[PDB]
Design a binder for this molecule. Structure first.
Ligand code: NAG
Ligand code: NAG
Ligand code: NAG
Ligand code: NAG
Ligand code: NAG
Ligand code: NAG
Ligand code: NAG
Ligand code: NAG
Ligand code: NAG
Ligand code: NAG
Lengths: 730, 730
C-alpha cells in the first residue's frame, strides 16, 4: 500500500527503460549495453561486440558520448563535456581506429571543440573551434582551416549564435555535408549590431569577485544577427593552402529587409535546398540551388523558388517544415497547411507552378506530425488521425504509385497500452523500430517493413512493471471538453482510488505556448505523479486556443495577441472541471514554467477568483523582454506602426493589483540566459509597488531549466511545500 | 484600547517631533517653520523671518535643502536631488541674494554638482563637478577651475571614492576650507588598480535591456585606492589662469606600504592637522603642518608628529578620534584609550614628547563619547559616566584651569524622562540646546551657558503624548546581565500589560558589529514597537563582546576573529532571557540587518537548538566579500601570512547543514552596492547544495537599506508574516 513519493520522483527510484538504437545500415544497428556498443542484426536477434567495455574507460569516466563514422571504420569519443545554452557545449575528442585497434594520436582534434561531425558517407570530419571551421579528409591527416573570420560573440562559422540556436535550428550546428562528401555547406552569422545582455555568475564561494557573462541577445524589435551561406569544395584542400568557399545569396523577395535562414536540406550532390524567412514570418521562400560544373557556381533560379505564405498567422509550426526529395530530386513532399488550415503532406515539383505548386496527398481534420521516410514506392509518416485523438501518435504509410494504399502500422498492435508512437526506420526502410510511449508502460519492438511482422520485443518495461505492483499509482484520463462548438482536449492525473463522489484539490499544469500540447497519451513518471499518488491532488492540463496540432484555426487564434485567449481558455477549463463535480472549488491552483509561468501569472492576475494560489517558474512577464525570433513570430514588431499596443497590453506587471487575492510563488534562475531574471525582477517590483505580498525564490547560478541535481530537488521540494501550505495539507 | 499596529509604523501615524536648529552666531540661530526659515534670538524667544514661505517654491517642490552663507548674505538652494550610495548624491543649485532680494542668475553653478560648500567665513564657494574642484570668491563671479584630472571612477578631486566615503569619512566631501578662507585643502583619490564589482539595474519596466552599474570596490585584500593631499591658495585665483596647488605628503612611517588619509582638521590659517593610518590599522600618525610664508610650502616636521598605537586591536572606535585645538593652536585635546583601555580625553602639546605625549583629563570605567566644544576656559563633552549606564548619554564640562571643576549639565534635568542627551552649543558656547532622546518622549530645551538656566522649552512632544494616550504602548527595560564577572547590558521591548508570570515569544534584534550598541536609553517608534504592542512579542537586544563603549577589553575581544564571541554571546544572552522565566522557550527568533544579518545567520547555523527561526537581511556571508577598510580593520589581510584561516573559518555557508533545524528567511536588495547580492547568492547556493529548505526574497533595484517607500513597507509586512507563521499567530 505504498505510494509514489516525492523522493521516488527526485531520486528517480522507478527507472523507465527505452531502446535507443543507431541504424548502421539497412539491416544492422548499434545498441549500448552495459557500456558496450553492440552490433545487432535486424531479422535474427543475432548480435556481436562492436566496442568493448574497455576503450570507454581509457578516458576515465568523462566519456560523454560516442559517434561512429558512417563506414564503421572509426569512432569519435566525446569527453570533457561542458554545457552552454540549450544545445551548445564544448568537449574534447579522440578518434579510435577500429581496424588498427587503437587511439589515433597524431593529428589530434583541438581540446575545446564547439562542434564536430562525420561526413554523410566516409570518414571525413568537419569541426568548429574558436568559431572557425576545420576539415579532415582522414582521421590521421592534418586539419584544413576553412574559415578564419571567427570571433567570439561576433562571427560564427558553422555554429549558430544564441538566437539561431534557440529559436531557429534548435541545435548548435550550422554545418551540412553534401551526400558523397564533395561539398561542405555552412552558415555564417554576424552578431555585430545585436545588443548585449548580462548576468552575474557567482561560481564557487572561493571566487572573490563574481564574473559577468555577456551574450549578444536580440529582444523584440532589436537589431538581429545577419546570415551568409557558403559551400566549400572539399576535394581540393590537399592541393591548396586555402580554398575559396562559394556563397549562395538568399532570394530577392527576402533581401530587402531583415530575414532568416530557415532550413538547409541537401537534395543530391549537385542540388541543395535552402529555406528563407522574412523577419515578419508570414512569408517564406524555398530555393532549390544547382551546381554549375562549368562556371563553378551555385544557381538558385527563381523558377525553382517556392513560396509559403500565411494570412492567419505565421509559416509552419515553429518554422517551415523540411522538404523530402525523391532520389532523382525531381519532386519533394513537404508538410503545409491545406485550404482548411490543416497541416498535411503535399507534393511539389522542382520548378514552381502558378498557384498549383502543391497536390495534397492527405486530407482531414487531423494533421501529419512528421515525414519519417521516403522510399521509391512508399512514404512513411506520423499523424494523430487515429480515433480523432490529436494527442495521439501513430505510424502510417502511403504507396506513392497509389495514394489509396494508405495503411496504419501501429494502430492495432496494443490499442490498450499503446497510442503514442515514435519510430525509427533502417537506412532504406527494410525494418522499423517502434517506440510505444503510449498510455501504458513504454514498449519497444522492431518489425520487418515488408509485412509488418514483429520480429521481437526490444524492451517491455516488465521490470518497472513488477516494481509498480507494490505501489498505488495514479491514473491518467485523456478526454475533451467542448466550448463554442469545438473539441478541446484535456488530461487529468487522478489519484489512486479516485472516487468521483468525493472532492479533490485541483492543480492546473500549464504551458499553452503557441502550437503546444500538454494533453496527450504519453506515459510519465513526474512530479504530478507524486502529487496525485501521495497528496491526492488532481493535476490537469488543458490544450486551449493557440494550442497544438488541430489546424490553424485553433493555433493561429492567438496571432498578434499573446496573453489573451490562451489565458482565458485556461480559466474556462478550470470552470468546466469544477462543473464535473469531483473538484473542491476551495482549493484550485495553477503553475507553469517559462511560457507556462507567464500564463500562470496572467491567470492569477486576472482576478477571476477561480484560483487560490499558483507558482510561476522563470516566467516571461512582458514580450519586449523576450527574444526577437520567438516573440515577433507571434507578436510582430513592438512598434506603433505594427503591434506596440498589444505588447504593452499583455504585461504581467500591469495586473499587479489582482494579485492581492492570491498566494503567489515566483521562482527564477540567476543565470537564466533564455528568459532573463529581469522578467521576474520586473514582476516582483510591480507587486511591491502595489503592496502585494507574495513569495519568491532565486536559484544562484541556475539555468532556465534549474536542472542541476541539487537545485532540481530543492525547487520541487519547495513547490511541494508551497502547495501543502496553500492546500492546508502540511 | 487600540494598539500600535504595523500600519501605525509603516504609515508613520505618530510623528515624533524634534528641534533641529542652526546656530548662526554666538546668540542667534535658524529654525525651519512651516517652510520658513526663522531667525531666533537665544535669550528672549524673540524671533524674525529670515527666508519666506516663498523663495522655496520658485523651484516647485524639489527644493531638497538650503545652506546659508556664514555671513548670512546668501543662501544655497538645493534641488533635483539624486541619491548615490550612503552620503553621495548630485543636485542642482541656485544662490539667492538676500540683500539684493533675488536669485543670482549670472555665473550659475553646474546643473549636476556632486558637492558644494560655503567657506568657513565669508561667501566663498567650493564645489565638485565631474570630479574636479571649482572655486567662486563671490556668488556673482565666475568659477575658477582648481583641478582638471577628474575622471569618473578613476580620479576623484575633493570627493571620496566608494570606500573612503563609506568606511573612512562617512561623507562624500573631501574639501576643507581653512579658517579665514585663504587656503582650500582637498584629497585626491586614484581608483586605478581597484577591481570593479557590478550589479544590474532594471529600472522602469519600459527599459528593454537592463543597465549595468560598475563601481571600483576593494574587497578584503584587494588593491586599494591611493591618496594625495593638496592645499591651494585661494587669494591668487583672480591673477592667474591656473594656480599650482601645493601638496602635503603623508609621513614616512606610513608611506612604505598601503595606507589611508584618516582625518583633516584645520588648526589655524597657517596650521593644519592631518591623521594617517596604515592599511593594518593598529598604527596611526597625526602630523601637524605649518605654512612657510617664505618658501610657500607646508612643512610637517616629525617633531610635531603624534603616534597612536594599539596592541589589542585597532586605533579608535572606527578610526582615530578628531583633535580639538586651542585658539593659539599650542595644544589640543583628543579622545584616546588610557592605560586601562577606556576612551578618555587627554591633552597634547604641538610637539610630541617621548612616551608622555598625553595627560589624561578623564579617568574611570566609562568612556567619553565625544568632545562637543572647546572654550578658552571650558571643555564640553558627552559621556556615559552617569549611573554607570554605558547606554546613556549626558553632557559634561570641565574647567581647563581647574580639572576638578567637572560638572554634569543634563543629569538632574529630568532623570525620569531623560537619560540620552544630544547637544548643540552656539558659536562660542554662550547657549546650548539639549536634545533629550532619553527613555521618554524626546524633549528639546535651550539653556544659557553661564548658569545652565533653561531659557525655555523648544519642543516637548505633548502632541505626540496626547495621541499615545489612547494607545496601549509597550515599555522598554534597559538592564544588564553578568557573565564571567562582567556587566553586559541588554534591553527589552515589553508588550503593554506585561505579566512576568506568563510566557511570551522572544525576538532577538541583532547587529553586534564592532563597537556597536543596540541596548541604550533612546526612545523609538519602530517595528519592535508594533511587534510588542500588537503581537505581544518581546523584542530584546544584547550588547555582548566586541560591542559598544565599555572599554577596549570588551570591544577588542573580537579582534582578528569575527563570527566568534559576538555570536556566542548572542546565544548566551538568549539562554539567560529564558532563565528569567517570562519567555516561551518554544518560540524564540532572531533577525538582523547587514552585520546583524551575518550574526543572525551565524546563530541560526550554530545548531545551538535555542532558536526556532530567523531573518537575515542583506547579510555579509564571508568576509572576503566585504570591503577592505572595514573588514581588514578587524580581520587583517586574508593571506596565509596573516589571518586567512579565520577568514575561511567564519563563513555562513560552512554552516549550511545546521540550518535543517530552522525556518530561515533570507532577504537582499538587487542593487546593494555595499553588501553585494553575491553574499546572499552564496548563502542560498550553500543551503541548496545541503538540501535545506528556506525562504528567500529579493528586492528589485533596492539599495542596502531597502528604504524606498513601497519596498520599505513590503519588506516589513513580509517579515511580519514570516514571524506570524513561525510563531503560530496568523
Ligand atoms: C561489461 O562491463 C560491465 C560493467 O561495466 C560488466 O558487468 C560486464 O560483465 C562486462 N561485459 C559484459 C559482456 O557484460
Ligand atoms: C504579413 O504580416 C503583415 C503585418 O505584420 C501584413 O501587412 C502582411 O500583408 C501579411 N501577409 C503576408 C502574406 O505577409
Ligand atoms: C466563445 O464565445 C465567447 C463569447 O462570449 C468567448 O468569450 C470565448 O472566447 C469563445 N471561445 C471559447 C473557447 O471560449
Ligand atoms: C528682538 O530680536 C530682534 C531680532 O530678532 C532684535 O533686532 C531686537 O533688538 C530684539 N528686541 C526687540 C525689542 O526688538
Ligand atoms: C600590528 O599588527 C601586526 C600584525 O597584524 C603586528 O605584528 C604588529 O606588531 C601590530 N602592532 C603594531 C603597533 O603595529
Ligand atoms: C566565560 O568563560 C567560558 C569558558 O570558561 C566561555 O565559554 C565564555 O564565552 C566566557 N565569556 C562569556 C562572556 O561567556
Ligand atoms: C548474424 O549476424 C552476425 C553478426 O551480427 C553475422 O556475423 C552472422 O553471419 C549472422 N548469422 C549467422 C548464422 O552467423
Ligand atoms: C557582418 O557585419 C559586421 C557589421 O556590419 C561586419 O563588421 C562584418 O565584417 C560582416 N561580415 C563578415 C563576414 O564579417
Ligand atoms: C506661509 O505659507 C505656509 C504654507 O507653506 C502657511 O502654512 C503659513 O500660514 C504661511 N506662513 C506663516 C508664518 O504662517
Ligand atoms: C594614480 O594612480 C594611477 C595608476 O597607477 C596613475 O595612472 C595616475 O596617474 C596616478 N595619479 C594621478 C594624479 O592620476
Amino acid at each position: 500500500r505504498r505510494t509514489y513519493t516525492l523522493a521516488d520522483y527526485l531520486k528517480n527510484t522507478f527507472r523507465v527503460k527505452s531502446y535507443s538504437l543507431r541504424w548502421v545500415s539497412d539491416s544492422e544497428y548499434l545498441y549500448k549495453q552495459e557500456n558496450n556498443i553492440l552490433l545487432f542484426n535486424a531479422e535474427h536477434g543475432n548480435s556481436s561486440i562492436f566496442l568493448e567495455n574497455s576503450t570507454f574507460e581509457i578516458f576515465g569516466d568523462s566519456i560523454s558520448d560516442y559517434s561512429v563514422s558512417p563506414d564503421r571504420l572509426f569512432v569519435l569519443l566525446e569527453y570533457n563535456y561542458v554545457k552552454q545554452w540549450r544545445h551548445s557545449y564544448t568537449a574534447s575528442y579522440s578518434i579510435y581506429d577500429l581496424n588498427k585497434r587503437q587511439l589515433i594520436t597524431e593529428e589530434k582534434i583541438p581540446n575545446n571543440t564547439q562542434w564536430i561531425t562525420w561526413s554523410q558517407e566516409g570518414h571525413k570530419l568537419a569541426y568548429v573551434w574558436k568559431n572557425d571551421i576545420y576539415v579532415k579528409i582522414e582521421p590521421h591527416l592534418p586539419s584544413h582551416r576553412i574559415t578564419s573570420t571567427g570571433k567570439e560573440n561576433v562571427i560564427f562559422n558553422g555554429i549558430n549564435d544564441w538566437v539561431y540556436e534557440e529559436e531557429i535550428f534548435g541545435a548548435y550546428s550550422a554545418l551540412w555535408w553534401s551526400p558523397n562528401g564533395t561539398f561542405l555547406a555552412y552558415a555564417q552569422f554576424n552578431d555585430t549590431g545585436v545588443p548585449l545582455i548580462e548576468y552575474s555568475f557567482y561560481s564557487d564561494e572561493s571566487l572573490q569577485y563574481p564574473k559577468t557573462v555577456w551574450i549578444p541577445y536580440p529582444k523584440a524589435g532589436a537589431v538581429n544577427p545577419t546570415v551568409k551561406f557558403f559551400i566549400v569544395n572539399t576535394d581540393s584542400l590537399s592541393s591548396t593552402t586555402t580554398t575559396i568557399p562559394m556563397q549562395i545569396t538568399a532570394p530577392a523577395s527576402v533581401t530587402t529587409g531583415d530575414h532568416y535562414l530557415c532550413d538547409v536540406a541537401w537534395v543530391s550532390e549537385d542540388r541543395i535546398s535552402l529555406q528563407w524567412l522574412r523577419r515578419i514570418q508570414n512569408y517564406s521562400v524555398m530555393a532549390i540551388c544547382d551546381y554549375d560544373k562549368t562556371t563553378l557556381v551555385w544557381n538558385c533560379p527563381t523558377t525553382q523558388e517556392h513560396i509559403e505564405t500565411s494570412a492567419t498567422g505565421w509559416c509552419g509550426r515553429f518554422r517551415p517544415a523540411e522538404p523530402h526529395f525523391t532520389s532523382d530530386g525531381s519532386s519533394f513532399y513537404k508538410i503545409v497547411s491545406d485550404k482548411d488550415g490543416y497541416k498535411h503532406i503535399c507534393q511539389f515539383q522542382k520548378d514552381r507552378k502558378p498557384e498549383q505548386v502543391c497536390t495534397f496527398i492527405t486530407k482531414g481534420a487531423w494533421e501529419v506530425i512528421s515525414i519519417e521516410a521516403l522510399t521509391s514506392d512508399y512514404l512513411y509518416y506520423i499523424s494523430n488521425e487515429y480515433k480523432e485523438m490529436p494527442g495521439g501518435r501513430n505510424l502510417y504509410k502511403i504507396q506513392l504509385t497509389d495514394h489509396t494504399n494508405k495503411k496504419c502500422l501501429s494502430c492495432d498492435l496494443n490499442p490498450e497500452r499503446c497510442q503514442y508512437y515514435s519510430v525509427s526506420l533502417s537506412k532504406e526502410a527494410k525494418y522499423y523500430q517502434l517506440g510505444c510511449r503510449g498510455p501504458g508502460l513504454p514498449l519497444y519492438t522492431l518489425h520487418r517493413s515488408t509485412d509488418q511482422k514483429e520480429l521481437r520485443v526490444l524492451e517491455d518495461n516488465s521490470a518497472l512493471d513488477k516494481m509498480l505492483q507494490d505501489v498505488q499509482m495514479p491514473s491518467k484520463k485523456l478526454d475533451f471538453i467542448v466550448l463554442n462548438e469545438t473539441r478541446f482536449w484535456y488530461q487529468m492525473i487522478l489519484p489512486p482510488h479516485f472516487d468521483k463522489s468525493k472532492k479533490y484539490p485541483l492543480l492546473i499544469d500549464v504551458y499553452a505556448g503557441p502550437c503546444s500540447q500538454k494533453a496527450d497519451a504519453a506515459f510519465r513518471l513526474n512530479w504530478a505523479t507524486y502529487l496525485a499518488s501521495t497528496e491526492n491532488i488532481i493535476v490537469a492540463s488543458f490544450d486551449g486556443r493557440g494550442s497544438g496540432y488541430q489546424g490553424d484555426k485553433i493555433m493561429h487564434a492567438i496571432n498578434k495577441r499573446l496573453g489573451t485567449l490562451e489565458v482565458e481558455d485556461q480559466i474556462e477549463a478550470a470552470r468546466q472541471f469544477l462543473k464535473m463535480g469531483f473538484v473542491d472549488s476551495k482549493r484550485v491552483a495553477i503553475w507553469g514554467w517559462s511560457y507556462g509561468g507567464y500564463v500562470t501569472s496572467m491567470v492569477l492576475g486576472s482576478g477571476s477568483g477561480v484560483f487560490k494560489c499558483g507558482i510561476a517558474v522563470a516566467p516571461v512577464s512582458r514580450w519586449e523582454y523576450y527574444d526577437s525570433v520567438y516573440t515577433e513570430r507571434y507578436m510582430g514588431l513592438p512598434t506603433p506602426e505594427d503591434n506596440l499596443d498589444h505588447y504593452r497590453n499583455s504585461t504581467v506587471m500591469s495586473r499587479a493589483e489582482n494579485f492581492k487575492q492570491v498566494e503567489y510563488l515566483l521562482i527564477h534562475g540567476t543565470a537564466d540566459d533564455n528568459v532573463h531574471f529581469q522578467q521576474s525582477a520586473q514582476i516582483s517590483k510591480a507587486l511591491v509597488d502595489a503592496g502585494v505580498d507574495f513569495q519568491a525564490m532565486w536559484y544562484t547560478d541556475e539555468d532556465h531549466g534549474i536542472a542541476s541535481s541539487t537545485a532540481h530537488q530543492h525547487i520541487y521540494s519547495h513547490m511541494s511545500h508551497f502547495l501543502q501550505q496553500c492546500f492546508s495539507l502540511r
